[PDB]
Design a protein around this nucleic acid. Structure first.
Lengths: 27, 45, 261, 71, 55, 125
RNA sequence: AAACUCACCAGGUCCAGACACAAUAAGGAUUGACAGAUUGAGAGCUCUUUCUUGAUUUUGUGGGUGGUGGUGCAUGGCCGUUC
């Protein structure tokens, strides 16, 4: 995530960008 | 009768009664945890 | 320029004790302070990037083993970047196990606590809450009062900080006596607002959050006698231009009533 | 019959030499008493485990404890 | 009411060493600026080391 | 061992006044045992003896003057117990009471390096 | 997918009293560069049985300084989000 949410589902450790699979169409 | 029942007087919309039909079988080998006792020597007759 | 008998001991150390679980440990990392060259000790500590076990019990490399001059250990600088980690290097900013188990009971010689592995705090940059965190250090293990008038004569000579007055809060229920070269340090604190024609300057408004209401409160606690007595109205500008309502009349009594120490 | 001395792994191999002694062996918690003989050859001491209250496919009575009585 | 009360003016004289901490740090440093040894690290220093490279 | 006059003016003026430091270690269990186990490099004694069951065997180091062996005595008995740690730590606001001792065993000296160790080599002439 | 991963488990202990004064506080309170016993299902740790100790700190206690309990309540910009 980037600190403007409490994002707990679909979490990301990949590649340091912290943008979810559900956040390619949001973030 | 206090010990000759299966269900308390809650009939009068609640429980289907859970029947615990005791059909025990022996535990022959040595050493038992919580688990392995009932799957020791099951002579399924 | 060193022989290769000793160079070939401290390069492949990241193969054995990376995952410290059990066993009887090898004997070429503990022998670093056994080397009489202690230029080769304090910098070959690998200070800040470890995996397993380090904030409370067991870092005592020079506290009570040796004297209290060179590694007099703890609170500012050399390991600041690990002291600033686990309050600031996660989004929840909480505590865990690598930042729990093996430093903070270094205090068994607390004369080996105030120069030499971390200490020189309020001179060259420090935020509001790093003797509040070390208030847990100074309020879960012992503190002398020998250093209390070494942390009242010294800390107020310097540029200003909230951790100084946090030390004041931790260290003026010790109730052990004031040297008279010291008492003038804490008081120059509220006067400089008006000009008579003492006539004052530009450094007018000093305000800080809640531990400032809890910590000037520590220099306003109990006594009346052992100050330089002219400094009463110097501190009564908390009722005069900063007037208080709730806990107001429970402040002003460092200077009014009790028999001093 | 000697004493049930405990042993708590799943990839350790016993060698047959020791006719006449007893060791208790890991089954998940407890220590199965084994009078150690040449009657085990290179197979795991921690193979002594089928660790569950048994799989209810013929008498499904503990599945009846998860269902819904309902008000 | 501290009055001498040894030794409050110095508190055994580790009281000036926080402002000039790198000036009382030299009150022990100059004596032991030492080069390297193989015989004075330990006496049998070629006997009490090799416990590491073989796990 | 014990203290001279110009170590009266060392001990009373410095160590007995060093009420925060108290760098001394005081006879019912251990100072003739400090003539047994071997952990006494400096001893400081007492001569207002009335607490002295072992001190009558510590005073084998009072009336036998190794020559670090100085022997001339001081008076006050409960010095550490009445001031400095074995009891009363009557100091800047304290008022305590624990029964103390009379037989100092100094091993180690801090910053006061050779202001305290004047009991070394200056009597046996 | 291997024990770790991996969010759970079958059994153990390194460790909690600071701040004041109260019992002992330097005859060992409690400290450590070490020698053993060390093992709980496999460990480092302890100092009763070499000796650093250095004034400091041991404990039945409570305000709570310790918010390294923040879930926060919104408040101040700032950009996923809603337009």
């Amino acid at each position: 995530q980037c600190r403007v949410c409490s994002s707990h589902t679909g979490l990301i450790r990949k590649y340091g960008l912290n943008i979810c699979r559900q956040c390619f169409r949001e973030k | 009768e206090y010990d000759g029942l299966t269900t308390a007087r809650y009939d009068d919309h609640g429980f289907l009664p859970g029947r615990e039909q005791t059909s025990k079988k022996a535990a022959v080998p040595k050493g038992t945890s919580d688990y392995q006792a009932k799957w020791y020597l099951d002579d399924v007759i | 320029a060193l022989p290769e008998k000793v160079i070939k001991a401290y390069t492949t150390v990241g193969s054995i004790l990376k995952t410290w679980t059990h066993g009887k440990l090898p004997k070429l990392f503990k022998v670093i302070p056994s080397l009489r060259n202690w230029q080769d000790v304090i910098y070959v500590t690998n200070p800040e990037e470890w995996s397993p076990h380090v904030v409370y019990e067991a870092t005592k490399l020079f506290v009570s083993n040796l004297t209290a001059k060179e590694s007099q250990k703890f609170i500012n600088l050399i390991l600041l970047e690990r002291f600033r980690d686990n309050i600031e290097t996660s989004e929840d900013h909480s505590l865990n196990y690598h930042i729990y188990r093996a430093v903070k009971k270094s205090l068994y010689k607390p004369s080996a606590f105030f120069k030499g592995f971390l200490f020189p705090l309020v001179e060259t940059g420090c935020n509001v809450r790093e003797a509040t965190i070390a208030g847990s250090v100074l309020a879960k293990v012992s503190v002398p009062a020998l250093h209390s008038s070494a942390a009242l004569s010294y800390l107020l000579r310097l540029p200003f900080s909230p951790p100084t007055t946090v030390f004041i809060k931790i260290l003026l229920d010790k109730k052990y006596a004031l040297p008279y070269q010291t008492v003038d340090d804490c008081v120059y604190y509220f006067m400089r607002f008006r000009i008579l024609d003492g006539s004052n300057g530009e450094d007018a408004t000093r305000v800080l959050p809640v531990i400032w209401h809890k910590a000037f409160l520590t220099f306003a606690q109990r006594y009346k006698n052992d100050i330089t007595q002219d400094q009463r109205d110097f501190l009564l500008e908390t009722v005069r231009q900063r007037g208080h309502k709730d806990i107001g009349p429970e402040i002003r009594r460092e200077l009014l009533a009790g028999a001093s120490r | 019959k000697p004493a049930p001395v405990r042993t708590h792994m799943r990839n350790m191999i016993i060698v047959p030499e020791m006719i006449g002694s007893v060791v208790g062996i890991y089954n998940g918690k407890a220590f199965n008493q084994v009078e150690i003989r040449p009657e085990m050859l290179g197979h795991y001491l921690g193979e002594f485990s089928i660790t569950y209250t048994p799989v209810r496919h013929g008498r499904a009575g503990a599945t009846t404890s998860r269902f819904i009585p309902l008000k | 009411t501290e009055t001498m009360t040894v030794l409050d003016d110095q508190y055994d004289q580790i009281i000036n060493g926080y402002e000039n901490y790198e000036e009382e740090l030299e009150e022990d440093e100059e004596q032991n600026y030492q080069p390297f040894d193989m015989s004075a690290e330990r006496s049998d220093f070629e006997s009490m080391l090799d416990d590491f490279l073989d796990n | 061992q014990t203290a001279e006059v110009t170590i009266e003016d060392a001990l009373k003026v410095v160590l007995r006044t060093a009420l925060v430091h108290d760098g001394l270690a005081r006879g019912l269990r251990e100072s003739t045992k400090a003539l047994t186990r071997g952990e006494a490099l400096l001893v400081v004694l007492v001569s207002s003896v009335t607490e002295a069951n072992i001190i009558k065997l510590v005073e084998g180091l009072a009336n036998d003057p190794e020559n670090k062996v100085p022997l001339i005595k001081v008076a006050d008995a409960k010095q550490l117990g009445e001031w400095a740690g074995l009891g009363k730590i009557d100091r800047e606001g304290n008022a305590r009471k624990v029964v103390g001792a009379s037989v100092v065993v100094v091993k180690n000296w801090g910053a006061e390096t050779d202001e305290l160790s004047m009991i070394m080599e200056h009597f046996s002439q």
